[PDB]
Design an enzyme around this catalytic site. Structure first.
Site, PDB file in Angstrom:
ATOM      1  N   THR A  65       2.649  -2.039   2.595  1.00 29.31           N
ATOM      2  CA  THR A  65       1.515  -1.815   3.538  1.00 29.31           C
ATOM      3  C   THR A  65       1.891  -2.243   4.952  1.00 29.31           C
ATOM      4  O   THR A  65       2.477  -3.306   5.154  1.00 29.31           O
ATOM      5  CB  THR A  65       0.246  -2.580   3.098  1.00 29.31           C
ATOM      6  OG1 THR A  65      -0.198  -2.087   1.829  1.00 29.31           O
ATOM      7  CG2 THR A  65      -0.882  -2.413   4.112  1.00 29.31           C
ATOM      8  N   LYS A 108      -6.855   2.816   3.987  1.00 25.17           N
ATOM      9  CA  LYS A 108      -6.815   1.363   4.176  1.00 25.17           C
ATOM     10  C   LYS A 108      -7.721   0.873   5.308  1.00 25.17           C
ATOM     11  O   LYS A 108      -7.996  -0.324   5.407  1.00 25.17           O
ATOM     12  CB  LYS A 108      -5.376   0.916   4.423  1.00 25.17           C
ATOM     13  CG  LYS A 108      -4.429   1.341   3.318  1.00 25.17           C
ATOM     14  CD  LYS A 108      -3.045   0.751   3.496  1.00 25.17           C
ATOM     15  CE  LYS A 108      -2.076   1.343   2.489  1.00 25.17           C
ATOM     16  NZ  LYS A 108      -0.757   0.661   2.545  1.00 25.17           N
ATOM     17  N   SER A 162       5.632   0.653   2.507  1.00 24.12           N
ATOM     18  CA  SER A 162       4.803   1.521   3.339  1.00 24.12           C
ATOM     19  C   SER A 162       5.346   2.943   3.359  1.00 24.12           C
ATOM     20  O   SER A 162       6.543   3.164   3.146  1.00 24.12           O
ATOM     21  CB  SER A 162       4.749   0.978   4.764  1.00 24.12           C
ATOM     22  OG  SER A 162       4.352  -0.381   4.774  1.00 24.12           O
TER      23      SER A 162
END
Ligand SMILES: [Cl-]
Ligand SMILES: [Mg+2]
Ligand SMILES: [Mg+2]
Ligand SMILES: [Mg+2]
Ligand SMILES: [Mg+2]
Ligand SMILES: [Mg+2]
Lengths: 231, 226, 250, 244, 204, 243, 195, 196, 241
Positions: B1, B33, B169
């Site tokens: 992330t 997110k 990510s």
């Protein structure tokens, strides 16, 4: 009248009738006398029987080696309050290695009785107590009322016809306070005091109850033939 | 992330990648997110995905009730205070690492908050496994008095650094811009630099390829009349 | 201390009446008139802003309240009782629904939750019933537009149009003559203003009248763009100016 | 203290009656009449709404007939708000039973549970009882079609035909007169509506003043169907039975 | 020891043109020991379908819990719950056990009765929602399922083509997992007809 | 009527009759006073000698709270003890958390809120005492008086009990004749006089005088009982003034 | 305890349970009956941790007997097995879980069918034609997979059960001291006193 | 972390670095470790950032409620509230707090509350991981009743050395001056203090 | 007739205990007034020290609830201080939980909700007080919000409370009818205080010395009360024109 239904209600003149009715139960109780010198403190109690087959209701309760009381009124209430005193005397000894001062014992009894006069659901205690003891400041006598009022005295009496004994002690004040180092003479003065409250009946061997505490005297109760010497 | 937040002239921008993973496996390739706490207070979450979602909705719910109770538009400091006290109470067990941004009658705000309940203030922030890649970009190109366009550019570039360099990510860049005196604009899939190429082959099967033992109609309708 | 009133304060009398509920309804009767009208494409709820003093800022007192983005409420009776009920209704919409299903409750179920709270004040220990009747207007996807009345007893009924409080008997008769199943929202607002004028003594304008609608989604009131499925609240409180504009076409 | 204001809701009268239960029953006697009739091939629930208005939204309105589960329904007479409290509890009990045993709750077990809850409010807690009488219409594979009633005392009984609410004395006499054991649902539908038509305090019995429901094995094959009648369907059955 | 791989099993869901498909294997085991070949992992509440992988006691418990909740929902709402709403209910219900969770991998599949839109969703054991457009996978062969689905899947497949795609995704994934297999079921779901098909597969 | 049968009930006047009846118990009690001096406070109380059997100087009425606050009260003595016990708990918790001894105004509100709480419910009875209390803190001397209603104010001089009218008149003279202020030693003397003068309302029985004081210069801001020579000196001064 | 087996044939359910009770070093008993009658047509065998097995079994028995009296009705085997499963599923997340695995053999008088349910201590329920707990299945299932038919008589079930026990006695390291065998059918529960 | 508070003639000054690390990563290089719990009562925080923030927020609440009832609290009172929280929750906290405040009666005061939750009133205090390296320097260079400029120099030089040797310390040196005149914030950048 | 003793409905739908709590409100025989300026909110209240033995500095019905919020009370001091302590606790808790200072109107609503509870719950009596909260809110500006024993509250342009509230109210009404604005158009709070005192003098028909009044002033970021000498300076300015 309209204000005596519970302990949580003041009357228009600022009276608490439930407390006053609890005070009345003491007046119906049998006479008990308390008096002290500078070395000893004495309790004398006239025990009451139900009839000729029955025993004479015990009036004196030991709270510690150095303290105890006599009762007049509801006996079960005296058992509750004396049990509390036993615990408080005991707490002082166990936690602080210290004998509970008689004056502090009076303060504790006052506060315990007070909570029952300001709250709903409860009732005042229906008993009067005379606490004697010998602590680090000498001999002591206390009078407990279930209103919460605790008073330190040289001598006193509570129960039915207690006024006769109280007047006698008020006369004898200067004599019995000086009876130092003579337990028998102090008890005699107490037996003579309680005699001023008798009518029709006299002090017999199962009628009379005496307690004493002093300088080198643990709180001890005398009943039966142990009080024949004083009759 | 990878999540970032960047302050600018008249507001604040937050951005995030769109990859959610279970160990080395990509569970969802287009994950959202950027969470809304209130119309103009948004935040981005890293860590335990359920926790970041749950803590955002709980505080968002209480923020809404607070806004109705006080007849005032919600403040970022309120969301921050409620989030941190909730997270602190749970001593890090709620694994929510958030970048909280927004505009309110007091102005524009940007905060970070960690799972243990610690908070921080900044003009530029990054969180998650790709935060170091993102912060490298932010530390290289951030300046005071950024314009809206410059901040969006910087924020998305910082997410890209995470996308390309951090294995945690990937996929797309989501952005949300919160400007003072304006509606917050949520830009879902602002960048799409990871579309899969056409496969070499179609794997559509001939009908009747699979062996079948039994067929039956499933009654999804309620008990019928007559 | 402790709450020692653990017994019901509302009880059945020999005739079968629940006195405290009847008396709560009497308090509602003394309350200022409020009304609700349901149209085909919306619902309107309205009441008079009976200002207690001209020095008081009556805009700071909201008689018409947003419960959810698609549900609004108005009352007749005791204002303070209403205010706390609105607080509880707003919260219960979240705790017993939105935090479970991720969406706002349908009108009938929120009404049901409010009704339950009012019922409990009628049976629980050491409390009196709420001295309000509520009119709750709302919209949801599967039930469309709806209007409900909730009484002190906790009983609730769905209405096409109704009135509660002071001049409710006259107002309901007025609404019976005017209501049909083909009304557009603007027609309902017009009828609402006509009906409300009869029960108002003094000033009749946008500053003395509180009026809100449940109608079309308002994307301009959402506060954010970017999510197609989120299109904004259906509840909208009319401005003082918007009311006055319709009072010229009255 | 507080004792002064205590009505003492859970005490016997000198005659051995529960004051609040008796007064709650008095309240229920003013509620709209509800009737249940059990036939060999199903059960009928018919109930009168209380003096309504033309502006009441009838098609979304429910004050009398409620679904507890797919097999059991109730007709309400008394305080509607009180009934909904009990109804929700009954719905939960049914689901608790279904989760525990993986079988639909037998009708009597549900009825006993709700009745026990009512009983509790008459013996302890110092709260007023629920001012509600229920007619339970239900089906299970043990006893088949069943009718019960419960009242604020928490006492319940089983019935072939029964009424609650207003004019039960008149209603029960009329039911006792025309009810037969070999009766069918369509006959029971007619009896229920005829009885309401005669006992009603209104001038005439119309569709907008009624709630109607049937529980039939008129569900395709070995299963049971609940039918809460729509306003138009109540209007049709009124014409069919020749009341309007 | 790992609760999510004691009993074994898999669920996969896919979207097609005006249709969804959800499929599962039929195995229940005690680690290496096969116990049951009739343990279906897909349930339905009205028109909403729920597949659940993981610890079998929780699979059964959650099915009973969601039947419980959707039954009350229906009584109060007077309508059947929708896939989008039910997804939130599953998420809420799982997260309420945040620090003592059900060891499951739920999968929701269905078509919204009003919009007609096909819907699928996946969850981790504690409630995080994965709302994929294409496919959702769950269970002890989820890696294998990801591999199959990623290559086999294409959008807008017709119901009878989607059946072949999801069936082959399940079957070949299960045959590379020791704790999955022993039979398989595929649901093909359209707006007002659902077809259930048991597949023939190797029994080792 | 019936409004006076239950505590916390407002009469149609807006009065709490049960609190007013508690005041009657206070008015029935012995006289107690408080005098605020230059750097402290002096408390004095009339103790009725009901009988010769009462041990002199033993039944102490004035109570200390913490080490800097004195409390005296008229009315139901047990109620006063209950209030002081609470005050001692309040003072202890204040010092526990904040380190510094409780300031007198802060302490005044603690007692005030507690007494006021006993006018909020019918499950409790109001306090049957008016309490005069005070001491020295960081801002100097403070004297307060607290009624059954929970009402309290700061005072220059305070009096309650059966001889309160007499006492008040005497206190008012001191305030007028000493705008610059009174010394602690002067206040002790004056307190003795005022109790002796107020004893005319209780003239049937004889009494025992009890005095205490907190003074920055005389007691280092600690509460102490006036004993021995200083007490006798005050008794002599008082006896001289009544003759 | 150790071996518990179950087999559902045409018209009955047969439960076989070992007789040994071993406390570590010594076999304390060789005639232990690891079963409880829950209702006239429902039998439950059990195995697991000492103490908890009997405590759980008797607790279940008491509850089913209570239900039987309250309703004057015998719950179906399915209903009983669901009740038992929930109790174990509740138990597994308790402070101290019941470490008890059970087989429930019942004859459904309504459907006129025998039914065998296998439930482990986690609350994992399965309806089976034949089942076991512990290692018992490892030795016996290959024999049951081969010979089992749904139309078997009670006598054929017992013969197949004997073959299973013989294989257990051959390959199992522990001496489980034989098995007590009980049959559940339309007439109720009875014990085969020679096995 | 490198934090200190130093009493001087006109009051007290709090000093701190701005580095917050997660292992070897600097999670924040511009942290404000000088925290206001009341107008002229501030604190320096060291240890768990979550813990010291939680504690400070609770103290600020307590002193706000104190002020509403009893007027301005003393620095000693603030230190006592800090201590109560730190001592009673010692098992669950990792907090090392220096409390500094200005009264008009007491003037500048410094209290340090180390890990255990004990209180120590000092003329000056140093804490944090970096403080270890400047015990020698601070002891040799501290004088009582310094001027404002001397105290700023003392703190600047001290924290400069702490930053130089401690990897966990760095960034800018922040300072807050507490006097009768009011509250003044100071900041000193690396290019300034590194050449000292 | 126990419907008059506890907070349950009378047959007329009235709550007599609430009505009698309103009557207790005037027991102190004190009148208060609040007005808004451009940058400030001023509240003045009569101060009566009827006993010479009282310390006049401790006789007050104005309270500093928070840094920003002030509160004047009409009613007996025990109930006044009860409300004051609670309001202070509520304001402090609000700031801790939500990270910003509690607004005047929000505190008023909170205290009004608490009062509402006493009118519905039987075991709690209403407080016999009317609470006037004042501040300069950071969003709404100068604010006056008043709460009563019924649990009612509303914002005010200006307000008055006490036995002679009507005279003061009408006086204030007449002034705002002239000016046609919702506030006192004045820069300094000193002149807004002078306005407040002048119009109380006019309405009551009584003159005031420095010890007959009590004044509270709310400005941006602080509420404070004036000393007797600050009030004296105000009275001198009023007399000199
Ligand atoms: Cl509130
Ligand atoms: Mg396999
Ligand atoms: Mg195999
Ligand atoms: Mg920690
Ligand atoms: Mg460094
Ligand atoms: Mg009340």
């Amino acid at each position: 009248n309209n204000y005596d239904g519970d302990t949580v209600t003041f009357s228009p003149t600022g009276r608490l009738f439930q407390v006053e009715y609890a005070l009345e139960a003491i007046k119906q109780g049998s006479v008990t006398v308390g008096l002290r010198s500078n070395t000893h403190a004495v309790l004398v109690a006239l025990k009451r029987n139900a009839d000729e087959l029955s025993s004479y209701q015990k009036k004196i309760i030991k709270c510690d080696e150095h303290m105890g009381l006599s009762l007049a009124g509801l006996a079960p209430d005296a058992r509750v309050l004396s049990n509390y005193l036993r615990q408080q005397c005991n707490y002082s000894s166990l936690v602080f290695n210290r004998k509970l001062a008689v004056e502090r014992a009076g303060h504790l009894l006052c506060d315990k009785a007070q909570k029952n006069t300001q709250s709903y659901g409860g009732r005042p205690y229906g008993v009067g107590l005379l606490i004697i003891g010998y602590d680090k400041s000498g001999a002591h006598l206390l009078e407990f009322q279930p209103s919460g009022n605790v008073t330190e005295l040289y001598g006193t009496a509570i129960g039915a016809r207690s006024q006769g004994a109280k007047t006698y002690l008020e006369r004898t004040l200067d004599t019995f306070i000086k009876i130092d180092g003579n337990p028998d003479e102090l008890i005699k003065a107490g037996v003579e005091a309680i005699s001023q409250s008798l009518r029709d009946e006299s002090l017999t061997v199962d009628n009379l109850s005496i307690a004493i505490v002093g300088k080198d005297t643990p709180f001890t109760i005398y009943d039966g033939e142990a009080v024949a010497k004083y009759i | 992330t990878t999540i970032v937040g960047v302050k600018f002239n008249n507001g604040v921008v937050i951005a995030a990648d769109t990859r959610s993973t279970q160990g080395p496996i990509v569970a969802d390739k287009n994950c959202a997110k950027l969470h809304r706490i209130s119309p103009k207070i948004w935040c981005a979450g890293a860590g335990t995905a359920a926790d970041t979602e749950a803590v955002t909705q709980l505080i968002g719910s209480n923020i809404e009730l607070h806004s109705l109770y006080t007849s005032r538009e919600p403040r970022v400091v309120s969301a921050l205070q409620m989030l941190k006290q909730h997270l602190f109470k749970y001593q890090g067990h709620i694994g929510a690492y958030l970048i909280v941004a927004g505009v309110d009658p007091t102005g524009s705000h940007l905060f970070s908050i960690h799972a243990d309940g610690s908070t921080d203030v900044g003009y530029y922030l990054s969180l998650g496994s790709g935060s170091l890649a993102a912060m490298a970009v932010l530390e290289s190109h951030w300046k005071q008095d950024l314009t809206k366009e410059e901040a969006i550019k910087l924020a998305s570039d910082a997410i890209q650094a995470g996308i390309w360099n951090d294995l945690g990510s990937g996929s797309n860049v989501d952005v949300c811009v919160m400007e003072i005196g304006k509606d917050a604009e949520y830009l879902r899939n602002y960048l799409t630099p990871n579309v899969r190429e056409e496969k070499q082959k179609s794997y559509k099967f001939p009908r009747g390829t699979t062996a079948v033992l039994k067929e039956s109609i499933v009654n999804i309708c309620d008990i019928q009349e007559e | 201390m402790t709450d020692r009133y653990s017994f019901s304060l509302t009880t059945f009398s020999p005739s079968g009446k629940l006195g405290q509920i009847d008396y709560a309804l009497t308090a509602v009767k003394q309350g200022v008139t409020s009304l609700g009208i349901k149209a085909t494409n919306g619902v309107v709820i309205a009441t008079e802003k009976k200002s207690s003093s001209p020095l008081a800022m009556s805009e700071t007192l909201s008689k018409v309240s947003l419960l959810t983005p698609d549900i609004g409420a108005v009352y007749s009776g005791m204002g303070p009782d209403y205010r706390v009920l609105v607080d509880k209704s707003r919260k219960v919409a979240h705790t017993s629904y939105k935090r479970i299903y991720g969406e706002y409750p349908p009108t009938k179920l929120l009404v049901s939750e409010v009704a339950k709270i009012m019922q409990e004040a009628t049976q629980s220990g050491g409390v009196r019933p709420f001295g309000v009747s509520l009119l709750i207007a709302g919209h949801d996807e599967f039930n469309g537009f709806s209007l409900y009345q909730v009484d002190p007893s906790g009983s609730y009924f769905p209405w096409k149009a109704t009135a509660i409080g002071k001049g409710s008997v006259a107002a309901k008769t007025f609404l019976e003559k005017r209501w049909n199943d083909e009304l557009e929202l603007e027609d309902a607002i017009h009828i609402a203003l006509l009906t409300l004028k009869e029960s108002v003594e003094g000033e009749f304008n946008g500053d003395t009248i509180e009026l809100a609608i449940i109608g079309d989604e308002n994307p301009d009131l959402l506060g954010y763009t970017g999510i197609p499925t989120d299109k904004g609240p259906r509840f909208r409180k009319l401005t003082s100016q918007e009311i006055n504009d319709r009072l010229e076409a009255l | 203290g507080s004792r002064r204001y205590d009505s003492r809701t859970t005490i016997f009268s000198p005659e051995g009656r529960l004051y609040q239960v008796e007064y709650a029953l008095e309240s229920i006697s003013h509620a709209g009449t509800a009737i249940g009739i059990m036939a060999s091939d199903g059960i009928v629930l018919a109930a009168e709404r209380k003096v309504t208005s033309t502006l009441l939204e009838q098609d979304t309105s429910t004050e009398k007939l409620y679904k507890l589960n797919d097999k059991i329904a109730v007709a309400v007479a008394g305080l509607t708000a009180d009934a909904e409290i009990l109804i929700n509890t009954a719905r939960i009990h049914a689901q608790n039973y279904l989760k525990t045993y993986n079988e639909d709750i037998p009708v009597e077990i549900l009825v006993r549970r709700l009745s026990d809850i009512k009983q509790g409010y008459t013996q302890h807690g110092g709260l007023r009882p629920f001012g509600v009488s229920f007619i339970y219409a239900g089906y299970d594979d043990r006893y088949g079609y069943q009718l019960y009633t419960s009242n604020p005392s928490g006492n319940y009984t089983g019935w072939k035909a029964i009424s609650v609410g207003a004019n039960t004395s008149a209603a029960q006499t009329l039911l006792q007169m025309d009810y037969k054991d070999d009766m069918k649902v369509d006959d029971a539908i007619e009896l229920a509506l005829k009885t309401l038509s005669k006992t009603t305090d209104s001038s005439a019995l119309t569709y907008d003043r009624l709630e109607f429901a049937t529980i039939r094995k008129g569900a395709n094959d070995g299963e049971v169907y609940q039918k809460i009648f729509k306003p138009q369907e109540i209007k049709d059955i009124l014409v069919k039975t020749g009341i309007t | 020891s790992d609760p999510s791989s004691i009993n074994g099993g898999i669920v996969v869901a896919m979207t097609g043109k005006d249709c969804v498909a959800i499929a599962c294997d039929l195995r229940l085991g005690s680690q290496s020991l096969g116990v049951s070949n009739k343990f279906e992992k897909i349930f339905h509440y009205g028109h909403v379908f729920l597949g659940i992988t993981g610890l079998a006691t929780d699979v059964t418990t959650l099915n009973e819990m969601f039947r419980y909740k959707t039954n009350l929902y229906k009584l109060k709402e007077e309508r059947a719950i929708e896939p989008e709403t039910f997804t939130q209910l599953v998420s809420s219900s799982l997260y309420e056990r945040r620090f003592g969770p059900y060891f499951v991998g739920p999968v929701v599949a269905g078509i919204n009765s009003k919009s007609g839109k096909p819907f699928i969703a996946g969850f981790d054991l504690i409630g995080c929602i994965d709302e994929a457009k294409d496919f959702i996978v769950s269970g002890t062969a989820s890696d294998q399922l990801f591999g199959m689905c990623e290559s086999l899947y294409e959008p807008n497949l017709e119901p009878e083509d989607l059946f072949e795609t999801i069936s082959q995704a399940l079957l070949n994934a299960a045959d590379r997992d020791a704790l999955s297999g022993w039979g398989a079921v595929v649901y093909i779901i359209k707006k007002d007809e659902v077809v259930k098909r048991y597949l023939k597969m190797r029994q080792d | 009527t019936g409004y006076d049968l239950s505590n916390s009930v407002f009469s149609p006047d807006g009065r709490n009759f049960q609190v007013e009846y508690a005041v009657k118990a206070v008015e029935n009690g012995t006289t107690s006073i408080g005098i605020k001096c230059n750097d402290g406070v002096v408390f004095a109380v009339e103790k009725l000698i009901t009988s010769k059997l009462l041990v002199p100087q033993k039944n102490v009425k004035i109570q200390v709270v913490d080490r800097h606050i004195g409390c005296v009260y008229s009315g139901l003595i047990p109620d006063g003890r209950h209030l002081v016990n609470r005050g001692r708990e309040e003072a202890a918790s204040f010092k526990k958390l904040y380190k510094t001894p409780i300031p007198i105004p802060a302490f005044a509100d603690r007692l005030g809120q507690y007494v006021q709480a006993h006018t909020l419910y019918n499950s409790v009875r109001p306090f049957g005492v008016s309490t005069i209390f005070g001491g020295v803190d960081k801002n100097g001397a403070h004297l307060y008086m607290l009624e059954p209603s929970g009402s309290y104010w700061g005072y220059k001089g305070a009096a309650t009990g059966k001889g309160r009218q007499s006492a008040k008149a005497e206190l008012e003279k001191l305030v007028d004749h000493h705008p610059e202020g009174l010394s602690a030693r002067e206040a002790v003397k004056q307190a003795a006089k005022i109790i002796y003068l107020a004893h005319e309302d209780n003239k049937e029985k004889d009494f025992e005088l009890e005095i205490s004081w907190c003074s920055l210069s005389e007691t280092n801001g600690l509460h102490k009982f006036v004993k021995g020579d200083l007490l006798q000196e005050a008794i002599d001064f008082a006896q001289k003034e009544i003759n | 305890m150790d071996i518990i087996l179950g087999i559902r044939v045409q018209d009955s359910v047969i439960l076989a349970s070992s007789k040994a009770v071993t406390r570590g070093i010594s076999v304390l008993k060789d005639s232990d009956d690891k079963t409880r009658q829950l209702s006239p047509h429902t039998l439950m065998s059990f195995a697991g941790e000492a103490g908890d097995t009997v405590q759980f079994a008797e607790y279940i028995q008491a509850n089913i007997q209570l239900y039987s009296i309250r309703e004057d009705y015998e719950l179906s085997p399915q209903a009983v097995s669901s009740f038992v499963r929930q109790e174990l599923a509740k138990s597994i997340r308790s402070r101290r879980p019941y470490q008890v695995n059970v087989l429930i053999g019942g004859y459904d008088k309504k459907k006129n069918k025998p039914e065998l349910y296998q439930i482990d201590y986690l609350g994992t329920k399965v309806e089976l034609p034949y089942g076991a707990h512990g290692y018992s299945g490892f030795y016996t299932f290959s024999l049951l997979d081969h010979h089992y038919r749904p139309d078997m008589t009670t006598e054929e079930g017992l013969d197949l059960l004997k073959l299973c026990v013989q294989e257990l006695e051959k390959r199992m390291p522990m001496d489980f001291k034989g098995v007590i065998v009980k049959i559940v059918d339309k007439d109720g529960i009875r014990q085969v006193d020679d096995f | 972390t490198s934090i200190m508070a130093v009493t001087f003639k006109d009051g007290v000054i709090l000093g701190a670095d701005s580095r917050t690390t997660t292992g070897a990563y600097i999670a924040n290089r511009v942290t404000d470790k000088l925290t206001r719990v009341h107008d002229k009562i501030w604190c320096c925080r060291s240890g768990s950032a979550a813990d010291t923030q939680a504690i400070a927020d609770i103290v600020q609440y307590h002193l706000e409620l104190y002020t509403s009832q009893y007027g301005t609290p003393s620095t000693e009172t603030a230190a006592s509230v800090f201590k109560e929280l730190c001592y009673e929750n010692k098992d669950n906290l990792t907090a090392g707090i220096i409390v500094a405040g200005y009264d008009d009666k007491n003037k500048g005061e410094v209290y340090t509350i180390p890990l255990g939750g004990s209180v120590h009133k000092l003329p000056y205090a140093i804490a944090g991981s970096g403080s270890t390296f400047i015990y020698g320097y601070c002891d040799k260079n501290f004088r009582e009743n310094m001027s404002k400029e001397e105290t700023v120099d003392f703190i600047k030089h001290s924290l400069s050395q702490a930053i130089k040797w401690d990897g966990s310390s760095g960034g800018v040196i922040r300072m807050v001056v507490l006097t009768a005149a009011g509250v003044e914030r100071l900041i000193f950048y690396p290019d300034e203090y590194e050449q000292l | 007739g126990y419907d008059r003793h506890i907070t349950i409905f009378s047959p007329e739908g009235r709550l007599y205990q609430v009505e009698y709590a309103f009557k207790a409100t005037n027991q102190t025989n004190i009148n208060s007034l609040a007005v808004r300026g451009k940058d400030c909110t001023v509240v003045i209240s009569q101060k009566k020290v009827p006993d010479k033995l009282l310390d006049p500095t401790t006789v007050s019905y104005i309270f500093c609830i928070s840094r920003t919020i002030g509160m004047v009370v009409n009613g007996p001091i025990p109930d006044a201080r009860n409300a004051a302590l609670r309001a202070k606790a509520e304001a402090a808790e609000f700031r801790y939980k939500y990270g910003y200072d509690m607004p005047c109107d929000v505190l008023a609503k909170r205290m009004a909700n608490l009062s509402q509870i006493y009118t519905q719950r039987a075991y709690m009596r209403p407080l016999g007080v009317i609470l006037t909260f004042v501040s300069v809110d950071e969003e709404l500006g100068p604010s006056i919000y008043k709460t009563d024993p019924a649990g009612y509250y509303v914002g005010y342009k200006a307000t008055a409370t006490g036995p002679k509230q009507q005279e003061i109210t009408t006086n204030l009404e007449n002034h705002f009818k002239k000016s046609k604005i919702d506030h006192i158009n004045e820069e300094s709070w000193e002149k807004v205080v002078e306005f407040a005192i002048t119009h109380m003098i006019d309405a009551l028909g009584t003159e005031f010395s420095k010890n007959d009044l009590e004044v509270g002033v709310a400005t941006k970021d602080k509420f404070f009360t004036l000393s007797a000498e600050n009030i004296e300076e105000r009275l001198v300015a009023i007399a000199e024109q």
